[PDB]
A paper describes a structure:
As the multifunctional protein within the Flaviviridae family, Non-structural protein 1 (NS1) is considered as a promising target against flaviviruses. Moreover, the sNS1 lipoprotein is involved in virion production, immune evasion, and multiple aspects of pathogenesis. The NS1 monomer has 352 amino acids, forms 2 α-helices and 20 β-strands, and contains 12 conserved cysteine residues that form 6 intramolecular disulfide bonds. The NS1 monomer consists of three distinct domains: a β-roll domain (residues 1–29, β1–2), a wing domain (residues 38–151, β4–7 and α1–2), and a β-ladder domain (residues 181–352, β10–20). β3, β8, and β9 are from a ‘‘connector’’ domain (residues 30–37 and 152–180) and connect the wing to the β-roll and β-ladder domains.
Here, we observed that the recombinant sNS1 dimer from a YFV 17D strain exists in multiple-oligomeric states, predominantly in the tetrameric form. The final reconstruction of 215,543 particles yielded a structure (named YFV_NS1_tetramer) at a 3.57 Å resolution. The structure of the YFV_NS1_tetramer presents an asymmetrical “H” shape, which consists of two NS1 dimers (Aa and Bb) stacked through the inner hydrophobic surfaces. The distance between the centroids of Monomer A and B (42.5 Å) is smaller than the distance of Monomer a and b (54.6 Å). Thus, Monomer B leans towards Monomer A, while Monomer b extends outward. The buried interface area between dimer Aa and Bb is 853.7 Å2 via a PISA calculation. The tetrameric structure showed that the interface between dimer Aa and Bb is mainly contributed by the hydrophobic residues from the β-roll domains and greasy fingers. However, the DENV2 and ZIKV tetramers have a buried interface of ~650–690 Å2, which is much smaller than the one we observed in the YFV tetramer. These observations also indicate that the YFV tetramer is in a conformation that is distinct from the loose tetramer and stable tetramer. Therefore, we define this structure as a “semi-stable” tetramer, which may represent the intermediated state between the stable tetramer and the loose tetramer. Moreover, we also found the YFV tetramer to have multiple conformations, suggesting that the assembly of the YFV tetramer is flexible and that it has the potential to shift between stable tetramer and loose tetramer states.
Residue numbers in the entry:
A (entry chain b): 1 to 108, 130 to 159, 165 to 338, 346 to 351
B (entry chain B): 1 to 108, 129 to 337
C (entry chain a): 1 to 108, 129 to 159, 165 to 338, 346 to 351
D (entry chain A): 1 to 26, 31 to 108, 129 to 337
The structure:
């Protein structure tokens, strides 16, 4: 990794050798195509899995779903010669990639559904979720079908960095920037193009010296557990708007709403969308310990105030 | 943060945004003009500290030494202009620093105040100040790097985080420092050190908030925490246990995973081990072909210290 | 100038301070906002120059034409408020800025100061100001000060040149020429021209000025550097070249529909001829006298044009 | 080619293609032909009646100093009595007469030593090396040199550089940097540093504008300096007898301590350069010049101030 870097704040121009981390969480992953190793071998594994009765594989990353989208036309016509007749149909869940609990099985009008909905035939469970791994540098072919059921994200594409008082928790579809002010550490950026559920591996987190009930992004949704994951006056956002499209976290009150500090709110509560079902705006909002600048999101339906901003549509993560 | 990397040959140039930490910043040892707060208030603070019975000071980095070396003239000038008897003398320890006990004291013939050097029998290191400096900013020069420093009125055993750095990538990680660089990679399992340059013997503990991953205990860490080293799973080499007693108090080290000329590479499962870190050579500077290592790895680890090759506690005669 | 640079052949990553020349020969000239010296004064200058009796003002660079097209409205407002009644309208030549021979005049039925006017019969290319303008600094992004000094050489505040071993680059906002040295001699491997100027390269911005004419590839008149780096073996000067076209480019490759066979029975030098005839057919038969084995060809508006040395066994009238 | 500058404070960049030259790139590891063929060439040169060599630049001398021991070892292995020694001229390298010859009782082949009456420079080899490759490798800019058997009095053109811009220019080299700018008409030098003393002429194909006559060039031609209109300071003619034989120089536009210069139309001029002080370390504040400028120029070399030929005490 030979290169240069410029920091206009610190006006430094060091070059040479080292370690660099990038911010490729935006629309830049479509540049390089994804070629799984030995597509012929994958057909045998798919055929073996169908024997038990597994409904299908629900992907965990947008890259995984794009791999299936690209290979749908390239693998469906392959096994036609072998006369196996296992049709592959790819559904389109937008960004609500959920967790399944099953690994692959060993080699010993049917349709192999992928990302099937909550149909009565079988639930989200009884499906393969995260039984895959990258070979290297995730030209090259980088895919591996392993039988190791793990409840974390794959660590060959992730990253993290600290450069003094800065911070960064990089990921292909996730990014969290942190900085230190007045001693404690705070969050000032957070984006997520999807809704994963693999927990951040402990080998890529910075400063594991915190417990639960004090972070901002819970570890279930795929948030790092670190001292750099915290905002003053806010606890873990269990009932937050984490089931949405590409998000963003802003430290500002929303256009039409306002927050009035009080002391008779209903504890934690649950988050509420800015626009209620009744169509009437409610400027009455109360807070207990949060700072007077509220936190604002930017996703599918717009503003979703956190749990602590109570009035006087709801998150369904659990 | 608006930088990027290059790859000669394949002709790849991917540019974007992120966080960058470099290794060649550990090459320009003497390129910084350290600036304290001011000649006046610092002299007043050290005079106040000496007022309540303090022998002297003790440098914590290889930067504070040059700061005092460059500002001793101004300190003496302030002492002369203040008509004060106190004076400071700066000796030259090679690279070894030890632990003090007190910070700069509270505000409200020739004097002696040893900034750093051989500790006389007058008093132990207890009657000294060790860690009272905080870096608020790193560099404001257009291309060069001038360092400003702050005053701290409390005793903290941790280093200062304004100069550190630690980044991880795909099967790679590094913990940077102006006088230290640890490089790791993961092959067939866990992580392991493949490059480790140490240039001084500090004694400030690496902050807990700059360690990439705390899934490790104080049982199998190569560089000890007290010597100054990250408490992270990236800071170890398989087959070699904690180096609680090693050649960390020497000239710039270059830990290498190879043997040394004139030596023997044999692994013995019964020879004595886990004692001290004895010198590889003898008084005459000649090789001894009797080295043994315990449960180890085939490529031995050899230090490059003052006298040349050194061996860890896993290798004994 | 502080910065960093790379070299894919030398494998360098040096940084520091020095001199930098860039390849901003793209459509970056439209980003600069041209602010002449006190547009109120420019009205008086134009009024004077008109009173002494000069037809128009054929700009030399695309920057000047863009400046005039942008500031015609403001100058119109100025001499409409001040009651001067000398109408100024900006016409549009494609890229064929020619040479006029007059500097501005000294200070002290509608008037028509046509800018970049076509060669009409009302008055010739004379009575036209050509190059009485001078960039000030930092080539308001870019200023401009009027002068009264007739000049043939280009304006030196925007040009550039650099040699870094065996490489070369004669830069300009609307020009580029990347030279290289192989087997001792120097050649040309890149050439672009977004327009057709006629200001000569100044002798203070040419590298290795030690050669005469009859050995160049782009003559001085078209605005070509006078240097040993401006030369291709087997070709003399391109006096009768296709230099009156749109953005050009020189290629060391025969055009797809044609090929050239080395021979010794051609019809002298003559003049350049397009590959395609008037009727739309392509001529596949070409010959040569002393040119090198790989033929050269341009790519402008009408398409491929071969140099003077290639003949077939109303066109470009540069002369 | 894909590099760019910076605009600190304005926080903007202009990154693209072009040509870049630099000053403070400042290590080096020169590699000759090979330990064998070079040994054969120098052996043949000794056989044909050449006393020794003569280094031309601080690169060739360093290469010889580094590789003389290996050359002697190859000589011992091949059983030849020739031995080479690398004396140390301070920073002065002078001219030879002959190039290397084609391939096919302790003898002495001094690399660059004294001018003893043993033999003059006539029987010496001066410039017979060409740098085929430059830079590369791990930021060491390794340099590979190929023997050349023809006599030329021009420097090696693969390590030079010369750029011009809007009212700025610079002639570059690993041991030379002339910086010119244009103010109120003509060009003038505003920075000049020479870390060596060579006698190779600047190549004619790397001079930015040769509209100059060889009578108004500040740095002369034989000493090694660009032949260009950018190479002069107004009011000063050619310094043929200058303080050029020193360690790293710095042409500065200022007076000297304890000395003052007054333009006098009576005293003579155009002589030889003399130090501002004397052999006893005493300054002489009686300096006069003919046509000069208000700020005097002074070379800062080994001995400190030196005044050009237009200033006499």
């Amino acid at each position: 990794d030979q290169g240069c870097a410029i920091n206009f704040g610190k006006r430094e121009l060091k070059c040479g050798d080292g370690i660099f981390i990038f911010r490729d969480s935006d629309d830049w992953l479509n540049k390089y195509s994804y070629y799984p190793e030995d597509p012929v071998k994958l057909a045998s594994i798919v055929k073996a899995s169908f024997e038990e009765g597994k409904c299908g594989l629900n992907s965990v990353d947008s890259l995984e779903h794009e791999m299936w989208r690209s290979r749908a036309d390239e693998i469906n016509a392959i096994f036609e010669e072998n006369e196996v007749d296992i049709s592959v149909v790819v559904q389109d869940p937008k960004n609500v990639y959920q967790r399944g609990t099953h690994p692959f099985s060993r080699i010993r009008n049917g349709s192999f559904i992928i990302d099937g909905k909550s149909r009565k035939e079988c639930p989200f469970s009884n499906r393969v979720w995260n039984s895959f791994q990258i070979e290297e540098f995730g030209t090259r072919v980088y895919m591996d079908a392993v039988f190791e059921y793990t409840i974390d994200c794959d660590g060959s594409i992730l990253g993290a960095a600290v450069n003094g008082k800065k911070s960064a928790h990089g990921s292909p579809t996730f990014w969290m920037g942190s900085h230190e002010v007045n001693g404690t550490w705070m969050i000032h950026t957070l984006e997520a193009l999807d809704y994963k559920e693999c927990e951040w591996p402990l080998t890529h987190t910075i400063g594991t010296s915190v417990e639960e009930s004090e972070m901002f992004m819970p570890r279930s949704i795929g948030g790092p557990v670190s001292s750099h994951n915290h905002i003053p006056g806010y606890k873990v956002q269990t009932n937050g708007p984490w089931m949405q499209v590409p998000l963003e976290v802003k430290r500002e009150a929303c256009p039409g709403t306002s927050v009035i500090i009080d002391g008779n709110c209903d504890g934690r509560g649950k988050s509420t969308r800015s626009t209620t079902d009744s169509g009437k705006v409610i400027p009455e909002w109360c807070c207990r310990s949060c700072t007077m600048p509220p936190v604002s999101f930017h996703g599918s339906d717009g503003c979703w105030y956190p749990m602590e901003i109570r009035p006087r549509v709801r998150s369904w993560v659990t």
